[model samples]
Target: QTVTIPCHHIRLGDILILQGRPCQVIRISTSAATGQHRYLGVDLFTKQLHEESSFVSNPAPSVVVQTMLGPVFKQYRVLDMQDGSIVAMTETGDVKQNLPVIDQSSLWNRLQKAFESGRGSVRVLVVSDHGREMAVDMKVV
Candidate 1:
């Protein structure tokens, strides 16, 4: 029973994914009364942050980002676009008649843009993540 080694091993000096955002810890501050663990230093995770917003975290827990929880993606051939939905076929010859596209993501906006083109018969193609309803930015096959 020598420390258990905390199976997760993301060092605090290293950057990691924190609550879905890539960030780095500034200082533990010894669990200060005001701040616990602050996650700072992120050009990618910047734009909206307060000095108080960044501090303390478990590098061990953050390791899950790279170790587990893999996000997947897939390709869909646009077949038809309807009200809040999209009809597309997969490479496996399966047709998703109601691919309900949402405005929550640019993935939906950019890919579903064909519907707005209103050509009535526009050929479109794109890529998107394959889990949940929110898709992401993509390009041609």
Candidate 2:
């Protein structure tokens, strides 16, 4: 279910629809040049920055975006590895395998370097965005 909230309540870290996509509030400030109190948002999936002006008495649709598709971040230690997939263990010792790994082209190349080096263990930052498990960050440790 979604909710509509007063524009004044859209604070930092809240999720809202900005530029037609779900974005997280990164900063809120007003400019004297524009006389507008606004929100600066980062696209949840794209990491792009966006800005919008909010009027205090208006209702904002941000609640719906946050309610429907908030992303979750978690950390895990690697247990098994491959060129394309991996097995990881969480802090609580829960085991998970076959999780999808994501990365920027160059960074993923760096991850591949560690994977083939025989060091055997690594760490990953996972995101449960879009209601699915995907790993987009890693490091050899």
Which candidate should be chosen as best, given lDDT against the real structure?
Answer: 2
Per-residue CA lDDT of model 1 for 3-114, tens digit only, reads 1112144344443434444334343232366433444433222423322233333569554221311123455667666776777777788877776543323656676565
True-vs-predicted CA distance for residue 90, candidate 2, Å: 0.8
How does each model score on TM-score? 0.38, 0.47
Identify the runs in model 1 with alpha carbons over 4 angstroms from their true place: 1-66, 114-134
Candidate 2 similarity to native, TM-score: 0.47
Q: Which candidate is the best by TM-score?
A: 2
Candidate 1: worst 10 consecutive residues by lDDT?
1-10
Which residue pairs in candidate 1 collide?
Answer: 37-55, 37-56, 38-54, 38-55, 38-56, 39-54, 39-55
Which pairs of residues collide in model 2? none
Stretches of candidate 2 exceeding 4 Å from the true structure? 1-72, 118-121
